[PDB]
């Protein structure tokens, strides 16, 4: 349980919002505004109440203490100026006090310029907190990392709370992972089971069925006793795949699509998993498997989706992920999706409006699903615990 920004009266109060405004920038201009558009209702909620609003973010790859116009939040400020009637201005020196009026927006320069940021420095965190009455954490995508503007500030701020974006994220994750509606189906696709083993373990305890995809599925196929040829798999994780297979309901591709080489030119051949040649690499599941997964996902009441079931980057190996993506979309289930690869699939098949909740949390999304403690959330849970 966390305190919510939306439950507070911010009239004439100094509000420090940590947002994710790490947008792609080209020639001093924003090229993708998705993150700002998501953040805007949080900023405006505070502004409309006549609050003294400060918003800040990380951007790009700066070195602490080393300023760089390349990683300045100026392009974000300009965007905000065009999209807001309220006066907007960038402030570069603020660690020792900032002048903020009611109804105006101050953008505090890239926090990653500040020494002690990555290390969650106490002195820096205290300086952040002294700037505000209320600290608002609204960047779930950084909540998994203990940093001065994401974690430490919440230790010393008079009030520490969650913004609308963070709160909606926690609600969605809760709905899917805590007493789900039942036929909770999870999909874990990826190139390596090693990198997603904790994800697999955590979900295997929750899901009624756990669907494996991509290179993860390959290792599971090898675990079933099928030779995978030159397919991407991990021999040192066959035992983990075998362990999960024999103890959990985990669908494994019965048929598969193979290639001769790893290219966008390479042709696709549909074969059973019993007949993979030593020089054939699996790059997508077959038709029979895809239709099987589609049926399972149709009957689900809750779906968690993370990763592809094939190399959808190649048209010849896109069919499998298309069927799965559309099955989740057309399903009456509450569907949550997360992961860079997953979102690219969502955009590719044009089903964003069909998924109940789309997480942009990336690494933070995966770490929450793992059952790992996210520092920013833990902080907010602690402050909210009186
Ligand atoms: Ca304006
Ligand atoms: Ca506007
Ligand atoms: Ca092993």
DSSP-derived secondary structure for 310-378:
B-TTSGGG-HHHHHHHHHHHHSSSEEEE-SHHHHHHHHHHT-GGGSSEE---THHHHHHHTTPPPHHHH
CA–CA dist 13, 350 (Å, integer): 41
Assign 41 to helix, strand or coil. helix
Q: Structure solved using which method?
A: X-ray
Centroid of ligand 3 to alpha carbon of 370 (angstroms):
19
Over its C-alpha atoms, the chain yields an Rg (Å, rounded) of: 23
Dihedral through CA 296, CA 370, CA 39, CA 70, nearest 10?
-120
Strands (E), 10-76: 14-18, 25-26, 29-30, 52-56
Q: Which of 24, 39, 37, 23 is nearest to 138 (CA)?
A: 39
Centroid of ligand 3 to alpha carbon of 65 (angstroms):
43
Q: The CATH number of 1-163+373-386 is which of 3.10.50.40, 3.90.226.10, 3.40.50.1260, 3.30.420.40?
A: 3.40.50.1260
Q: Which two tokens stand for residue 215?
A: 């290179």
Nearest ligand to the CA atom of 85: 1
Q: Is the CB of residue 364 less than 8 Å from the CB of residue 170? A: no
Centroid of ligand 1 to alpha carbon of 150 (angstroms):
28
CA–CA dist 113, 68 (Å, integer): 8
Nearest ligand to the CA atom of 243: 3
Q: How many CB atoms lie within 10 A of CB 50?
A: 14
Does 35 qualify as catalytic in the annotation? yes
Residues around ligand 1, an ion, CB closer than 5 A: 81
Q: ∠ CA 349-355-367 to the nearest 5 degrees?
A: 105
Does 363 qualify as catalytic in the annotation? yes
CA–CA dist 368, 212 (Å, integer): 19
The set of residues, in sequence order, having a beta carbon less than 8 Å from that of 71 and lying 6+ positions away, is 59, 60, 61, 62, 110, 112, 113
Centroid of ligand 3 to alpha carbon of 236 (angstroms):
4
Q: Which of 97, 174, 340, 350 is catalytic?
A: 340
Which neighbouring-strand residues pair with 3?
A: none
Cα 146 to Cα 133, 154, 230, 296, distances in angstroms: 21, 11, 41, 39
Nearest ligand to the CA atom of 86: 1
Q: Which of 13, 14, 18, 35 is catalytic?
A: 35
CATH superfamily of 164-372: Phosphoglycerate kinase, N-terminal domain (3.40.50.1260)
* Buried-exposed string 185-199: b where 16+ CB fall within 10 A, e elsewhere: bbbbbbbbbeebbeb
Could you write out the three-class secondary structure of 63-106? ECCECCHHHCCHHHHHHHHHHCCCCEEEECCCCCCCCCCCCCEE
Resolution rounded to one decimal, in angstroms: 2.4
Phi first, then psi: give them for residue 90, nearest 5 degrees: -90, 135
CATH 3.40.50.1260 domain range(s) in the chain: 1-163+373-386, 164-372
The set of residues, in sequence order, having a beta carbon less than 8 Å from that of 142 and lying 6+ positions away, is 18, 20, 58, 150, 364, 376
Which residue carries 């699939």 as its tokens? 345
Centroid of ligand 2 to alpha carbon of 48 (angstroms):
12
Q: Which of 81, 118, 192, 298 is catalytic?
A: 192
CA–CA dist 27, 4 (Å, integer): 37
């Amino acid at each position: 349980s966390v305190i919510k920004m939306t439950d507070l009266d911010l009239a004439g109060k100094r509000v420090f919002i940590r947002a994710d405004l790490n947008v792609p920038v080209k020639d001093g201009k924003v090229t993708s505004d998705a993150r700002i558009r998501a953040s805007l209702p949080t900023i405006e909620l505070a502004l409309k109440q006549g609050a003294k609003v400060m918003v800040t973010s990380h951007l790009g790859r700066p070195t602490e203490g080393e300023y760089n116009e390349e990683f300045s939040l100026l392009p974000v400020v300009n965007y905000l100026k065009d999209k807001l009637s309220n006066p907007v201005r960038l402030v570069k020196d603020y660690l020792d006090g900032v002048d903020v009026a009611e109804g105006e927006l101050v953008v505090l320069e890239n926090v990653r310029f500040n020494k002690g940021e990555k290390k969650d420095d106490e002195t820096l965190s205290k300086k952040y907190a002294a700037l505000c009455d209320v600290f608002v954490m609204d960047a779930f995508g950084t909540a998994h990392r203990a940093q001065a503007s994401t974690h430490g500030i919440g230790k010393f701020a008079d009030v520490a709370c969650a913004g609308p974006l963070l709160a909606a994220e926690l609600d969605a994750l809760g709905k899917a992972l805590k007493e789900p509606a039942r036929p909770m189906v999870a999909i874990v696709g990826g190139s390596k089971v090693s990198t997603k083993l904790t994800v697999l373990d955590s979900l295997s305890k929750i899901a009624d069925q756990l669907i494996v995809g991509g290179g993860i599925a390959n290792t599971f196929i090898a675990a079933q006793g099928h030779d995978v040829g030159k397919s991407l798999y991990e021999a040192d994780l066959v035992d983990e795949a075998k362990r999960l297979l024999t103890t959990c309901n985990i669908p494994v591709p019965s048929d598969v699509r193979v290639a001769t080489e790893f290219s966008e030119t390479a042709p696709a051949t549909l074969k059973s998993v019993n007949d993979v040649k030593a020089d054939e690499q699996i790059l997508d599941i077959g038709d029979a498997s895809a239709q099987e997964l589609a049926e399972i996902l149709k009957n689900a009441k809750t779906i968690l989706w993370n990763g592809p079931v094939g190399v959808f980057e190649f048209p010849n190996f896109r069919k499998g992920t298309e069927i799965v993506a559309n099955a989740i979309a057309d399903s009456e289930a509450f569907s949550i999706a997360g992961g860079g690869d997953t979102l690219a699939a969502i955009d590719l098949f044009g089903i964003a409006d069909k998924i109940s909740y789309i997480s942009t949390g990336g690494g933070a999304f995966l770490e929450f699903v793992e059952g790992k403690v996210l520092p920013a959330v833990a902080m907010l849970e602690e402050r909210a615990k009186k």
